[PDB]
Design a protein around this nucleic acid. Sequence first.
DNA 1: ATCGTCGCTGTTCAATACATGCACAGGATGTATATATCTGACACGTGCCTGGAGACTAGGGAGTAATCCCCTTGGCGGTTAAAACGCGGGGGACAG
Length: 64
Amino acid sequence: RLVREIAQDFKTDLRFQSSAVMALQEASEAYLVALFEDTNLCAIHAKRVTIMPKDIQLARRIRG
DNA sequence: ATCGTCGCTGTTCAATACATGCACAGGATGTATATATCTGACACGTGCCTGGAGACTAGGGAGTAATCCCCTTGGCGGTTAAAACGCGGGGGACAG
C-alpha cells in the first residue's frame, strides 16, 4: 500500500507485478540494514551505544 | 580618709594600602588596496581541406491492427501472530 501510495503521486491508474513489489522490498530492507550498520558505527564513534538521528544524518551526508 | 591627677592597658573605630575583577586604549602583524609594469595567452584573420550536405535507392525495422489469455486486481472471512498500550526501573545520555 505504501509503494502504491508513492507511485500514485507520479501516475494514475497503475498496476504492479507482485515480483516488482518484492524486488522493491528486498532492495529497501537491504538499504535500511546497511544504513543502520553505518549508523551504529557512527554512534559507537561518538562514545555512545544508542543510535540517534544525528548519526543517520551524518552517515547519509558522508555517503553523498 | 578623700578627691584629683598621673603613670601604667585594652578595645573599638576609622583610615589607608593592597589585591582582585573589568574595560579601553595602543601597537604590530596580516590583509586589503592602490599603483606601476611588463607579458604571453587569447582572439581574430587567412588559407586550406575533410567531413557535412544533397540526391537517390533498396530494404527491413517499426508502426498498426486484430486476437489471446495470462496476470493482476478484488472481495470475503477465520485463526492468529503481530502490533499496540501501559508500567516500572535501570543503565545510558549529557553536562560539569
